[PDB]
Each structure stands twice: as C-alpha cells, then as structure tokens.
C-alpha cells in the first residue's frame, strides 16, 4: 500500500482542483453522463413535484492524474475523495425544492490512464407539469434536465452514456408503471453569444398511474350512492320515508367529500375525471 | 508520560488512512460484520419506510497499525478517532431518506496484533415495500442491505462475526434484556445472508453485500378494537331492517340508509390509516 501512498503524494503535489483537468485551455472536457433510477419515491400532484432516488454516473479524463503502474508496484486504480479534484458541476435545472447539485461527495475511482468514474447518489426533486384530466387513469411525462451550471459547451462538453436511463436496479413502485424512459442531448446557441453553446441532457420518463387504490376507495362508493339515488322513486309516498332515504344519501355524499378532498389532487389546472363524477353524483342526488 | 501518546506517534506519524491495509494491490481486506438492533422505531405504511435504531460491529486487520503490549508498557487497546484510520466505508444501500452513513462517528479501538474494531451506532430509514393484501392482519419482510460504497468484492469482502462459542452470527443480534418490543410490530425472524454477484467476466469486477431480512408481524389489536368490531356490528344492524313493520312508522329505510351513512364515516376513518 506504500506505493499508493507515494503515488497520491506525487499526483497531488501541485494539483489544482479549481483549474479544469486538461493540458491546453483550448481543450474541451468530455464528461459521459448516465442516470440510474434506483427508485421513484413519490409524485406530488398538488405541488407538481416528482422525487426520485438516482445515481448520477459521470466519466471524464484528468490529464494531470496519469501514472505508469510499473513505477508504483503495478497499481492501476485508486480511490480519491471527490472534493480533492475538479468535478463537473452538473445541476438539475428543473429542480423543484430539492438540492440543485450533488451534495454527497463520494469517492472517485481514478485509473492510471487518467480516467475518472464518479457515481454519487442523489435525491432529485424535479418540477413535472401534472395533467389531471384523466385522473386516476392519467399518464405523466416527467423530465430531469441536467447541465453544467457555470461551464458552457466550449469548455465542458457533456454527452449521454446511453439512449435510455439505467433501470436495472429500479425498485418496483406500488403506484406507477414506467412505460417509457429516454435521454436526449440538447445544444442551444444564442445570437448574442454565438461562441458559447449551452448543453443539457434531459432524461424523460413516461409513467402510468395504477388506479386500483382510487377505484376501490373513491369510485365504488360514488357508484353505490349514484345507484341508490334512483330507487327512492320506487318508494311509496305513504310510507313517509322518501325524504329520509334521499337526504341520507346526500349526507353520505357530504361526508364522502372529506375523503374526496383529502385524496383528490387540490389543483385547478383542470377538472379531474373523478371530480367530474363526484359533481355529477352530487348534482343528481 | 502517558504511553498512549508514544504508541499513537509510533502508529500514526507515517500512516495513510486513504490506502487499504494490504501489502499488495490484489490482496483483499476481510471485514467481520455484526448488526445489533436496539429498537424498531416504526414502519410508516404511507411512506413505506422502516425506521430502526442499530449499531454495527465491524472488525478487520490493519498490519500497519500492529503493535505489541510489551513494547508499550502493557497497553492492549488504543482508542482513536475513526477519521485517522482507513475504514471500509459500509453504508446502507436501501436507505430512503438519503442517509447512507452512521449516526455517530465513534472511536475505533486498535488492539495489539493489528486488530481494528469499530462499533458506531446508527438510525436508519430504509425502504420496505408494504404488502397490503391482508392489512391489518399482515406480516412484512423488510430488507437491510449493507455494502461498501467504495470498494468492490475483490478489494473488500464480508464475513459474519462469531459469538464466544464460535458459531456464526448470520442474523440480526438483539440483546434480550435491553430489548423493548415495538408497540405494533413483533420481530419474528431476521436471517442475514452474504450475497456475491457480478462475478462474470463480462460483468466486470465482482460485487458483494449483506442482506438482513426482518420478518416482522403486525399486532392488529388497535384495528380490531377501534375499526373492525364496530364496523362489523354496524354492518350487521342492516339485518334488523327485515324485522321492522312495512308501514309508515316502521323506520326500516331509516335503519338501512343510516347504517350506510355510518359506513361512509368509517370509510373516512380508514382512509387515514391504509397504505396508498
């Protein structure tokens, strides 16, 4: 292990983490970026926030961190604290209320060729427009826009590792089914600054809600109330119980409005289908 | 003069906590692991989160930190901050709240012979997918997955600790005297297994971890007392409507529809507890 100690002493003798890890200032840093979705923690329809657990794999070459393994006892790879080297400052541009950048500074794997792999975890809370038109049978499309905050495409270049996010270690979700997932790279150049392109990678997920919870807890009671509402007209008037029955159905719906409001998304972007059905049942009782 | 200071200077004046304690790069560090559960704090069904309090016993060998008690006046143990020694960096992989590490960075105990012991306590919030089918008469299988965050299986491997009789502790250890059972959850089983995977040539370097499977049982007394029994009685009341007279003053529909209203109240009550 003394070879590794000597190596780490040698490499970081005059190393600068402020300075980009290239050999010419005209060089561009290539970062390969991959997203692994470990878990879809929660979709908040009211605030339109999707919270997920991710690993953000980043691969790039550091040209001041090369060595010959033969000169150091055959050591070919080492582990370095990520705070000790330059890193790309990938930021979640559409972060809702979470952390903008990586805050878990795990160790990087440094190879003798200068290749660095850094796979920190993160909890991404990303603003996702929620279309409640078909709720609880709705389909969402949640993106995660990632980019170097302070570096433009002329100094740091980012490319996706794969066409799709890595879902191999994805935990099963009890509320959503990810039908589709895909990552796209975008470059935007402005007329004012035509020599500083701005790059991003957007990972979008298309997710279908599993509606059994709302079917059991919401739709079936309203269906019962709606069904029971027509049968007061088979009651005789002389029994003196028509108003009792109908008013009790109305009171049951009024109590059920507690369940509706606590469960239904409290947003005004559109009328949910379940809300339409609730209003229909109320109006017709 | 305290011989501890001389021993500390001897062990740490030339020491690299960033390098593994291996004489060659391809040698593996073996870690002896035990996990002792102090309290099962809770299982949130809405968040599907198991909150537990544990402490992890982690033993290994550091040849650089080896010493003899004869050369240092009979010292058999030295407590030092854990930041001064190499650590295997064990983390709970299946945490839900983003908290990978331990709660308190306790001292490591360096024994003569190069044996290093670290016993930090931790509060862990882990993912536990709740099987809802038989709620509240349900049992859950919550995993606790421990692994090195940095090193692959060829660099750091795991073994289970042994008790004084030499038997392998391949489970969650619980001190019976100090244990207080959770008010709602009873821990029935807790086997531990050391898994190895990604060992193929195409899969790259091999990986390993330790998975403990807390098989826990719910005690449904609260739901029986407060929800199920009242709901059963109120739902049986509708059978009484068949015996009331079919006249103006029978109040047959009164009984039936008001039982429905009470059941709606129970739906509102139950919506605050069931998983989502």
């Amino acid at each position, epitope marked *: 292990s003394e070879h590794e100690t000597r190596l780490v002493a040698k490499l970081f003798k005059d190393y600068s983490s402020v300075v980009r890890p290239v050999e*010419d200032h005209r060089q561009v840093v290539e970062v390969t970026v991959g997203l692994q979705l470990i878990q879809l923690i929660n979709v908040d329809e009211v605030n339109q926030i999707v919270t997920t657990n991710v690993r953000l794999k980043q691969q790039w070459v550091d040209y001041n961190l090369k060595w010959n393994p033969d000169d150091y006892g055959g050591v070919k790879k080492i582990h370095i604290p990520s705070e000790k080297i330059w890193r790309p400052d990938l930021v979640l541009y559409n972060n809702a209320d979470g952390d903008f950048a990586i805050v878990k500074f795990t160790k990087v794997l440094l190879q003798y060729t200068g290749h660095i792999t850094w796979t920190p975890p993160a909890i991404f809370k990303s603003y996702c427009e929620i279309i409640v038109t078909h709720f609880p049978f709705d389909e969402q499309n949640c993106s995660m826009k990632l980019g170097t905050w302070t570096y433009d495409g002329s100094v740091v270049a980012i490319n996706p590792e794969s066409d799709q996010p890595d879902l191999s270690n994805f935990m099963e979700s009890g509320e959503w089914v990810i039908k589709e997932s895909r990552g796209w790279k975008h470059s935007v150049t402005y007329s004012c600054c035509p020599d500083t392109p701005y790059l991003d990678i957007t990972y979008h997920f298309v997710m279908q809600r599993l509606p059994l919870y709302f079917i059991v807890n919401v739709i079936i009671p309203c269906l019962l109330f709606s069904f029971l509402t027509g049968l007061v007209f088979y009651l005789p008037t002389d029994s003196g119980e028509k108003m009792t029955l109908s008013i009790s159905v109305l009171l049951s719906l009024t109590v059920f409005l507690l369940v509706i409001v606590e469960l239904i998304p409290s947003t005004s972007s559109a009328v949910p289908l379940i809300g339409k059905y609730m209003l229909f049942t109320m109006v017709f009782v | 003069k305290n011989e501890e200071l001389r021993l500390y200077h001897h062990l740490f004046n030339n020491y690299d906590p960033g390098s593994r304690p291996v004489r060659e790069p391809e040698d593996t560090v073996t870690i002896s692991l035990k996990v002792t559960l102090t309290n099962l704090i809770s299982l949130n069904e809405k968040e599907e989160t198991l909150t537990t309090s544990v402490w992890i016993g982690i033993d290994w060998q550091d040849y650089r930190l080896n010493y003899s008690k004869d050369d240092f006046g009979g010292i058999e143990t030295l407590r030092v901050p854990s930041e001064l020694v190499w650590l295997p960096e064990i983390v709970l992989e299946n945490n839900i709240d983003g908290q990978f590490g331990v709660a308190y960075d306790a001292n490591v105990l360096v024994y003569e012979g190069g044996s290093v012991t670290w016993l930090p306590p931790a509060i862990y919030r882990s993912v536990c997918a709740v099987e809802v089918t038989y709620f509240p008469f349900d049992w859950q299988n919550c995993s606790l997955i421990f692994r090195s965050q940095t090193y692959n299986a060829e660099e750091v491997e795991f073994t289970f600790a042994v008790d004084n009789d030499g038997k392998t502790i391949n489970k969650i250890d619980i001190d019976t005297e100090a244990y207080t059972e959770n008010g709602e959850w009873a821990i029935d089983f807790c086997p531990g297994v050391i898994r190895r995977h990604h060992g193929g040539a195409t899969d790259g370097p091999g990986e390993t971890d330790v998975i403990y499977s807390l098989i826990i049982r719910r005690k449904p007394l609260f739901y029986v007392i407060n929800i199920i029994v009242p709901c059963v009685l109120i739902s049986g009341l509708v059978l009484l409507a068949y015996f009331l007279p079919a006249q103006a003053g029978g109040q047959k529909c009164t009984v039936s529809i008001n039982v429905l209203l009470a059941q709606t109240v129970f739906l509102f009550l139950i919506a605050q507890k069931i998983p989502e």
Partner: antibody
Amino acid sequence: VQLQESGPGLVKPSETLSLTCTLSDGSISVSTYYWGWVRQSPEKGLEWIASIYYTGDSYYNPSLKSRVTISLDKSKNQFSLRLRSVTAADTAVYFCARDHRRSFWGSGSGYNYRY
Amino acid sequence: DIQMTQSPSLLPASVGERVTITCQASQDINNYLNWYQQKPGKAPKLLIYDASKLETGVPSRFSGSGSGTDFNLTISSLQPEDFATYYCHQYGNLPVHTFGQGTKVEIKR
C-alpha cells in the same frame, strides 16, 4: 484498465477472420474513446484497420474498407473485428487499441479533434 | 491519403550517443503526429504526442520536434532500455490513421 484479445489463431484462406476485444474494469460507452484494431506484420509494419465509436460511427482503412466490419457489444463491453476473404497477406499480430480522442474549441468552427 | 516515411530504416547506435529519427509526410499535417516505442514481442508504447509533447511517465531524454512536413524524435543520451522500434503515427480530424515503416535501433559493436 486492460484490453484483451481473443479469437482463433489460424484461419483458412477465403474464410472470415473474427476477433474480439474485451475490456477489464471499464465500459465501452465513453464519449472520448474510439475502439480500433491495428495489425503488425514484418513486411507492412504497423497498420490501422478500423475504429468505431460507442454510438456506432465507424471509420475504415481505405485499402481494407471493403473486407472489414467493426462492431460493438455494449452489454458485454466488447468490440469485434471481421476481416472477410482472408488471404496469406493478412497473417499478422492483431492488436486491439483504444484510440484516445481529445477535443478542442475553435472560434467560429466548433469542435476539432486529436487522437 | 497521407503517406509517412521514416529514416533511417535501421539506426545503429551505442549507449550515451545522441540518436535522431526522422519522419516525413507527403502533405502538410501541421503537428498532427505522435511517436511510439515498441519493444520486441510487446505492444507499442506512446512516447510523444502532438509531435513535441511528452507523455506522463516517459523519461525526459526523449524529445520531439516538427511543425510541418518533417518531424524528429531525439534521444539525448541513449539508455540500454531505449533499444526498440520507433514509429511515427499520423492522424487527422477524424480517426483515420497511418504509420511509418519503423526505425530499429541496435547496440553498435
């Protein structure tokens, strides 16, 4: 960390020479690397055959372009060469190599590359 | 279609002598040239890149020069582990590569 060749050491004439290169502790989906093949013979010296990018872009020696097919397998982190219509002139030591690409920014021209 | 020509095809030398190896391009390639060293029965090792820059870990005696159609690889003081075959490698903006014929260096007697 390391590249490892594999394939038969003897190919009859008119058959296809098939070789594979495997990576040790490394992925083929990196944007600053091309993966290529270079054959050395005593009569022709070092000679580059073909190179391929992880997105499928491929470049070929003009002399060997017709007979050469370079392919990837990202699942297993391998890349393979197929040289068809093989003859005695193709007896050689075939290396698999990592063509390391550096990028540079030019004002008004975009990215230019060195290898 | 750039062709590289190395010179001499065989360079006898001895330890301590200053050694020079020339490479020449048919066209002008700016400084888009690297130099490799290959021991017998071993893969080539990169020595110089961009025709003048030394790779990490290489001994400082190796030097490279040339900013046009003609390039040089110079060994200031030949070491007994410097006896190897040296190749000049030309690349372009795209990954299209050509190599020199190679220059063998033997101990002189």
